[PDB]
Amino acid sequence: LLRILKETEFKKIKVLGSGAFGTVYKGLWIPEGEKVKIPVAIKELREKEILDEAYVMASVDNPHVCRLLGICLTSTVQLITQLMPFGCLLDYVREHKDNIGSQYLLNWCVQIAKGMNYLEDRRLVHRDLAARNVLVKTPQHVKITDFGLAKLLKVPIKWMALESILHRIYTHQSDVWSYGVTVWELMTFGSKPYDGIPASEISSILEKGERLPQPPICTIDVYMIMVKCWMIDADSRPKFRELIIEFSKMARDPQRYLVIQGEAPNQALLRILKETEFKKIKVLGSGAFGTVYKGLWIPEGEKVKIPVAIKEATSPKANKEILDEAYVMASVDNPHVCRLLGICLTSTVQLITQLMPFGCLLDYVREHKDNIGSQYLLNWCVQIAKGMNYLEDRRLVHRDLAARNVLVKTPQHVKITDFGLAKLLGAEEKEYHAEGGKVPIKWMALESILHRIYTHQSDVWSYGVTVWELMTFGSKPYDGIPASEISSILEKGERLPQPPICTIDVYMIMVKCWMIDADSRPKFRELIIEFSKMARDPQRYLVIQ
Ligand SMILES: COc1ccc(-c2ccco2)cc1Nc1ncnc2[nH]nc(-c3ccco3)c12
Ligand SMILES: COc1ccc(-c2ccco2)cc1Nc1ncnc2[nH]nc(-c3ccco3)c12
């Protein structure tokens, strides 16, 4: 296992690089009694724990993690490892900055995840994961070193987790943070991390919220997963095995999941904003997942203050849900759906979106109950229908279309919000089986109130309920009926009553969304068409007193 070596066995040739404690020398080792000259690397520390440290270093065995081959107890202890002809991965991606594909980068990320998951299985803390600490033997095979501070259980601040910078706690979660920084560096082809800011302040910027920006090569899929680790809560960071299985799922089709200049990729841009860039002025109310505040946002380089709505220790499940919500909201771009300006990666993940001055539609029709015209309501219906049609094309079942989840920006243009519960469906999947949970029971369909099945037709049912709410000028649907008793009274075929302003055609459109047979319910395109025909004469189809 351990080879105690004499200085006479090896002779150095050329210095290859410099490390934190000492420089690595390329040299040829002559084993005792042997003539084969093995090319090895020798590290000399600029200086008996090191005996046991070499023991534990040699104990490792995995093609993605390096093993110390021998030590030499001369005037200063030296470490001998097998030489890697292709150098460090950081310099390699720097040299091939224009000649590296997505497949190679994703494969390298897979290899790093596999190797440090092995290190976790061996129960060793690297404490120094970085792009420079990654070495490549053959371009399709990279494998980690620099275990010189491993213990049985300045400094590279730019690659260190916030708990390591401040509280000096080095666990596998900090290693996951360092892995995320390494993936960032590999994506940027070796660009500096937090370039321009010296190490004395990288703790404050991390605490403030600003993180490593999205590289142009990166999609929102890989990058938001490439963050996943920069929250203060350590447990919220993904474990290594999940990282390997997910990146291997990524490696199946790498071309789609990254963009290289020279199955539609998701080029959505997500930007990280300082907590100091914006201030919470007005409380818009309490959302389903928390409280939403309204305030002016000051962006870098532009003095104009854009009023934005901000939404907010969150549980790891809550963190994953807010991760999915941020992905879904940033991935959409439609005139009638709310878009994500950016996120703040503080201890409580904060969501930054454009503000609508008049508030939500339900409150707007409640306060102005005596003044909405027929054209306003009809155009509102067509706009909500267009928004969820665009959502349907994006395969994001909203699952929460309520009058509270649609906002009034301008009287003639409304937007949909509250994408927290929206789950993206696969290209082959047609239904999603939610495992229950606390939900607005009084709005969902029978197939979701009893069978836990959410589909596009569930969104159609929610659309019908929202139309009924809009035509009722803000009256509460199903007044006095419990949450559990909704299914009992609805399985027969009884529905909400007729608003005073709805003609027979309005109700005939409304009912069809509420049919027991989901497949027989109208699709959103046909509803869009029907309400487009209704828009030719708003005064005919409604009666206003
Ligand atoms: C950061 O690099 C290291 C850190 C630690 C060691 C190590 C571990 C035990 C003995 O040496 C060894 C290396 N480096 C290496 N080990 C083998 N072959 C190598 N070819 N090129 C390098 C290289 C260039 C710049 C940094 O490393 C290198
Ligand atoms: C249910 O409503 C939301 C749910 C989530 C967000 C949000 C903020 C960041 C990402 O999504 C934003 C909103 N709503 C909003 N978005 C823009 N301007 C708004 N003015 N007033 C509200 C408001 C009051 C009660 C519920 O919303 C609102």
- Give the DSSP per-residue string, 404-415: GGEEEEETTEEE
Per the rule left: phi > 0, alpha: psi between -120 and 50, beta: everything else, 278 is beta
Are 510 and 457 in contact, with CB atoms under 8 Å apart? no
Q: How many CB atoms lie within 10 A of CB 12?
A: 14
Closest ligand 2 atom to Cα of 358:
20
In a domain, 135, yes or no: yes
Are 523 and 463 in contact, with CB atoms under 8 Å apart? no
What's the token pair of residue 103? 């497949």
Residues 410 and 516 in one domain: yes
Phi, psi (deg, nearest 5) at residue 162: -60, -40
SS3 label, residue 28 = strand
Q: Is 147 annotated as a binding-site member?
A: no
Whether ligand 2 lies within 6 angstroms of the CB of 287 is answered as: yes
**Resolution of the experimentally solved model in angstroms:** 3.3
Residues 325 and 236 in one domain: no
What's the token pair of residue 49? 């724990």
DSSP symbols for 79-127: EEEE--TT-BHHHHHHHTTTS--HHHHHHHHHHHHHHHHHHHHTT---S
Are 529 and 490 in contact, with CB atoms under 8 Å apart? no
Residues 375 and 317 in one domain: no
Give the separation between CA 124 and CA 436, rounded to whole angstroms: 39
* 393 assigned to active site: no
Taken as a whole, the chain contains a residue count of 545
Degrees, nearest 5: CA angle 145-148-149: 125
Q: Among 82, 108, 125, which residue terminates a domain?
A: 82
Give the separation between CA 143 and CA 129, rounded to whole angstroms: 11
Question: What dihedral do alpha carbons 339, 283, 405, 267 form, nearest 10°?
Answer: 10
Q: Considering its fold, how many domains does the chain have in total?
A: 4
Are 6 and 64 in contact, with CB atoms under 8 Å apart? no
* Pairing label, strands 432-433, 23-29: unpaired
Residues 485 and 380 in one domain: yes
What's the token pair of residue 269? 């841009």
Residues 172 and 101 in one domain: yes
What's the start-to-end Cα distance of the chain, in Å? 91
Whether ligand 2 lies within 6 angstroms of the CB of 311 is answered as: yes
In a domain, 43, yes or no: yes
Distances (CA, A) of 429 to 387, 432, 434: 22, 8, 14
Q: Is 119 annotated as a binding-site member?
A: no
In a domain, 2, yes or no: no
SS3 label, residue 159 = helix
Contacts of residue 129, Cβ cutoff 8 Å, sequence gap at least 6: 116, 144, 159, 175, 178, 179, 181, 182
What is the span of the domain harbouring residue 507?
361-541
Residues 318 and 372 in one domain: no
* 400 assigned to active site: yes
Contacts of residue 469, Cβ cutoff 8 Å, sequence gap at least 6: 362, 402, 403, 475, 477
Residues 216 and 105 in one domain: yes
In a domain, 482, yes or no: yes
Residues 315 and 295 in one domain: yes
Whether ligand 2 lies within 6 angstroms of the CB of 290 is answered as: no
Residue 445, domain CATH: 1.10.510.10
Q: Among 302, 335, 354, which residue terminates a domain?
A: 354
Distances (CA, A) of 179 to 9, 208, 348, 449, 499: 37, 21, 22, 42, 58
- Report which of 269, 265, 264, 273 is spatially closest to residue 301, judged by C-alpha positions: 273
Ligand 2, atom 28, residue with closest C-alpha: 359
Mutate to test the pocket of ligand 1, among 2, 15, 16 (most ligand atoms within 8 A of CB): 16
Residues 378 and 475 in one domain: yes
In a domain, 129, yes or no: yes
In a domain, 1, yes or no: no
Are 389 and 525 in contact, with CB atoms under 8 Å apart? yes
In a domain, 273, yes or no: no
Ligand 1, atom 20, residue with closest C-alpha: 87
Ligand 2, atom 4, residue with closest C-alpha: 418
Residues 405 and 348 in one domain: no
Residue 297, domain CATH: 3.30.200.20
- Report which of 315, 337, 342, 312 is spatially closest to residue 327, judged by C-alpha positions: 342
Q: Looking at the chain, after which residues does the C atom sit over 2.5 Å from the next written N, breaking the chain?
A: 47, 153, 262, 312
- Report which of 320, 324, 321, 326 is spatially closest to residue 338, judged by C-alpha positions: 326
Residues 480 and 343 in one domain: no
In a domain, 456, yes or no: yes
DSSP symbols for 408-451: EEETTEEEE---TT-EEPPSS---EE----S--GGGS-HHHHTS
Given the structure tokens 């001369």, which residue do they identify?
74
Residue 89 burial (C-beta neighbours within 10 Å; 0-12, 13-18, 19+)? buried
DSSP symbols for 340-404: EEEEE-SSS-EEEEEPPTT-BHHHHHHHTTTT--HHHHHHHHHHHHHHHHHHHHTTEE-S---GG
SS3 label, residue 172 = helix
What's the token pair of residue 191? 């660009």
Ligand 1, atom 8, residue with closest C-alpha: 146
SS3 label, residue 23 = strand
SS3 label, residue 158 = helix
Residues 30 and 124 in one domain: no
Give the separation between CA 218 and CA 215, rounded to whole angstroms: 5
Give the separation between CA 186 and CA 112, rounded to whole angstroms: 11
Are 150 and 212 in contact, with CB atoms under 8 Å apart? no
Are 428 and 495 in contact, with CB atoms under 8 Å apart? no
User: Residues lining ligand 1, CB < 6 A?
Assistant: 16-17, 19, 24, 41, 43, 68, 79, 81, 83-84, 87-88, 132-133, 135, 145-146
Give the separation between CA 166 and CA 176, rounded to whole angstroms: 17
User: Helix H segments across 147-295?
Assistant: 162-165, 172-187, 202-208, 220-225, 240-251, 254-257
Give the separation between CA 301 and CA 445, rounded to whole angstroms: 48
Give the separation between CA 361 and CA 405, rounded to whole angstroms: 8
Are 306 and 354 in contact, with CB atoms under 8 Å apart? yes
Ligand 1, atom 25, residue with closest C-alpha: 17
Q: Is 70 annotated as a binding-site member?
A: no
Instruction: DSSP letter for 26, please.
Output: E
* Dihedral of alpha carbons 414, 271, 423, 312, sign: negative
User: Helix H segments across 472-503?
Assistant: 485-490
Q: Among 317, 338, 354, which residue terminates a domain?
A: 354
Give the separation between CA 190 and CA 184, rounded to whole angstroms: 9
Give the separation between CA 513 and CA 509, rounded to whole angstroms: 7
Closest ligand 1 atom to Cα of 85:
20
